[PDB]
Amino acid sequence: LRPNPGANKRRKRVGRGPGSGHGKTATRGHKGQKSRSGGLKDPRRFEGGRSTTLMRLPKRGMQGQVPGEIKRPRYQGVNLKDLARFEGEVTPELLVRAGLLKKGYRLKILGEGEAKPLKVVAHAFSKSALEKLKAAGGEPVLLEA
């Protein structure tokens, strides 16, 4: 019976009509009622087409794969891991499958600060990966179908 919205929250701009005294809202006739006019963009659309193109995604719906999920040895070792075996499987918490564009696809070796690899078998190890993987101390592996 008291806690009114703290700061501002509550209705901030449902400003009614056009002006305390006066009122009318905008320009001249060009924007009447049935006036949801030249929408998004006129000459901007000209641009839109304005150019040949080199990106063609043809008559279809069934592409292959080579799973590009950006994973980071940095989140890993900085503070959420097990320096030898984690595997795609163990990466749930990992913020490299817990987002959206390929959750379950493939975890690559964002080899960065300090070493730059992966000491846990898997798939996605930058070349830089293979190398600092070998330095950091890791057993990486990669079986198929």
Add this chain to the structure above:
Amino acid sequence: MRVKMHVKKGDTVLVASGKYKGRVGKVKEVLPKKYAVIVEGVNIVKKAVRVSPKYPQGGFIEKEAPLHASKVRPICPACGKPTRVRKKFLENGKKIRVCAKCGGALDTEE
């Protein structure tokens, strides 16, 4: 005050009223409880007709409205009405029992 009722010809009390002096309930409807306690009317200073004396002004005015009347009165006045325990083969006897009691036995009085 519905398809169901309170007392009938009965004999009862006037709480919120002007009389309280209970007495003969000459008639009581089914829906509008409309009941006449023969306890407060008028004259309708009649037609001027020979319907009433050629020189008229009806007398017995008695349409009893309000329902704050304290129906039923055993050796007890204001009391609700019980129901049954049957007791006998085929026994409704929704007689009135509370504190004192009265059921309007078909005898000595209604």
Add this chain to the structure above:
RNA sequence: CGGUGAAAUUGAACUGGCCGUGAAGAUGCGGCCUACCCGUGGCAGGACGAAAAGACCCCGUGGAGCUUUACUGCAGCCUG
């Protein structure tokens, strides 16, 4: 005189002429000349009189009705 008892148009108006003036044809703003209160039966000038958001127009990459060997098809005819 008596019985009767409507109808558009219109801010409200108590609304002279002037010479002037003003968006450029004014009772209503300027300076000035006459002229009190009211009403009837008339006379048509103004108040752009009423009347209908001009059928003159323009304008609206508006509509609709012919048309023509404009554009595309439909019909029916002719035809492997």
Add this chain to the structure above:
RNA sequence: CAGGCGGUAGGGGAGCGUUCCCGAUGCCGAUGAAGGCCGACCCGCGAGGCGGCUGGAGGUAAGGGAAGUGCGAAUGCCGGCAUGAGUAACGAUAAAGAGGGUGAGAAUCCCUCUCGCCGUAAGCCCAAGGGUUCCUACGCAAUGGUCGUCAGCGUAGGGUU
């Protein structure tokens, strides 16, 4: 101390009532809910209290939430009420005047007496289509373009085989 403060379009800020939702119904109230009617304390305002009259029962907020909402104004929408107007108008230039009568009142009903216009129709007739009414008896506040004790008007009853 600056220092500024005409100012639509338009952009920013900040308040106003307004009917509902909690209203953690507080209740207030027949010594009145409410809307109303009037008023030289409150508000920089949108509003406020408060006083007085009406008026018959509601109404509601301390704090916050929800919105068919605040309107001259759109030849607007619906309902009133005005205006020329007590002038224009009464539906045909086929005219009517009297006497007595009945009546609460009769230019405007009834008889009867003078009189004009139809007559080739303002004739009768069948039919159509109307479908009450026709009659007889009461009545007129509505209706006839005022009348009106008259009616094809209102009330009732009977009426065509």
Add this chain to the structure above:
RNA sequence: GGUCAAGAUGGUAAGGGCCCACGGUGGAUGCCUCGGCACCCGAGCCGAUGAAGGACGUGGCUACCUGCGAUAAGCCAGGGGGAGCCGGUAGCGGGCGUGGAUCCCUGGAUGUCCGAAUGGGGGAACCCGGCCGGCGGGAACGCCGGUCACCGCGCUUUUGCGCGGGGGGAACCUGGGGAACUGAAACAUCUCAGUACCCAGAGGAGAGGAAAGAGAAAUCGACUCCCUGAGUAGCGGCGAGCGAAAGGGGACCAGCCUAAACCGUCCGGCUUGUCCGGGCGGGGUCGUGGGGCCCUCGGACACCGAAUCCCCAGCCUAGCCGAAGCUGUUGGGAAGCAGCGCCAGAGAGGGUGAAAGCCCCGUAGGCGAAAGGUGGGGGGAUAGGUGAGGGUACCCGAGUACCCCGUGGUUCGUGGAGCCAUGGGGGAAUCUGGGCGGACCACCGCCUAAGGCUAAGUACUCCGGGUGACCGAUAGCGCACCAGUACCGUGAGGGAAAGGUGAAAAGAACCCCGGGAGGGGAGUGAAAUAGAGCCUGAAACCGUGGGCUUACAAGCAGUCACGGCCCCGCAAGGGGUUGUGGCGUGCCUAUUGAAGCAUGAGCCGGCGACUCACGGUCGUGGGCGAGCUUAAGCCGUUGAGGCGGAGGCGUAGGGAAACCGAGUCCGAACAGGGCGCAAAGUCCGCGGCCGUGGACCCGAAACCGGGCGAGCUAGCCCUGGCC
């Protein structure tokens, strides 16, 4: 005191102007409802035993609203039920009933005439007819009556006996056929869209519904509906735009069959032997066999989609109880202020003359109950019919698959364009069979087509119940109660208004002007400025009285000043009223621009227009940085929230890609651009804000669909008359 010359001021309204009092017509309207509307559950078929839907009837005395229909305010029987009823009329004039009367329900009976109508016709609701019965004056007449389409449907070819349908229905529903606008700011591909609408038809819900499927993992496994799947994959004057599918999360989870010659059986066949035809079957393919020969076989658990029957049949409408106060008291009132005493697994609400747990209410408390009409459950029985192993020459689910063009689907608009689907011509395979993944070819894989049946989970709303930061009589259904009727239109078709007197009728005897209305009194009563259109009852406009004011005056208005009146006043002074004067072009819209002579504007009153859903997007108020949770399952007066972890957004990105990767594509180039740079977002809200949706609001020419009319008018046809 009188005469004359001069000057200055005064009152005197027919009406009008501002102010005050008091009326009237007008209904705002505050509140108030047996009335809507919104969501959710319940419910979901009517009809020839001629229905839905109406015409004319009856109520002693009734136009009408009612219910019945000719046995007509109803008769019968059973279920229910407490003592009153002869519906809304209360009035008249008569009644039935505690030897369950009014009435609530379930099954009863005639059940007028119309309406599918059907015995025939016909402008429906009215006129005709043929058969047996009857009565009357017999025959002729004429009534009750039972009687007599049509359809296709199967049965005895002769019953033409015995069935079926048809006729409806607010919305949902399947297929049949199927359109312009508007967008694409033109517009012809395109678009709205397979949308509106005409139709046919099965239902109570149909729809679809056991795979020549998916999809590529050596995977799934009916069909339907929800969330997600991307609005990506993509379709395209690649433009406006349009836009999937497997999977995953969820819900709901039966699967079952027939001709399929072979068997034999059989009857008809033709014509006889050994072909076809049609009945019984075993076979009667579920994810593949089925049949016929040889051998191992085999001697009790399975119910349907109602197989089916009996039940606690859920209800239908009637049921029942059921908690505790009185004294006082201010009041016309109290249920109120006050006193003490009271209930509570039931302080949900309404109702009893102003606001009660203990007063009215058969409610929340809990419980109740029936011999009819409906079944899921739980279980039984009824159980058709399913339910083995190898061997062997094979014959045994469709008449067209398939391929040419002509077309439909589909996220496909013509394309390299696949699969299903059909209009033309071609024109076959039995499990080495044949369509399907990749136009197509070589593979593997997939499924088993060209028959059949149905449940269960999303839709829909006529009808019932309930709840509403959903409405109050101009909003709500237009419609709150003799509104889908008044009334306009030819028909099609359009389509109002009017809610409240009061607490209860005690609503007005009676006297008085009057033809009447209506007007003064008496009584009403708490009021009648509560008096019958009669609550609250304001603005507008017209009225009766009072104050100031007004006849040498030129001005929207006004209004600053002041002076004369009159007013409350203690004075201060405050009111209203103005004559003298100063200065003052009225407001809205669209205008370079308005006094307008440009416009809107008649006056009052109530209505009267920047929203909602998402997408988003930027802000900013709030939770953790990885942050947040749909569809559901579950607990839920209050119904209490909890859980549900298919996801989408982040978390490097760079590229047409191959990919590489914090690096990177160009590239043979150490030169640039996307960065690296986290400088964490992610979610909830509130809000400026676009995109789609009618998105400030009402506004047009018109285009398109389906119907409506020749008593419209011109024509033509038939048929009288008149000149």
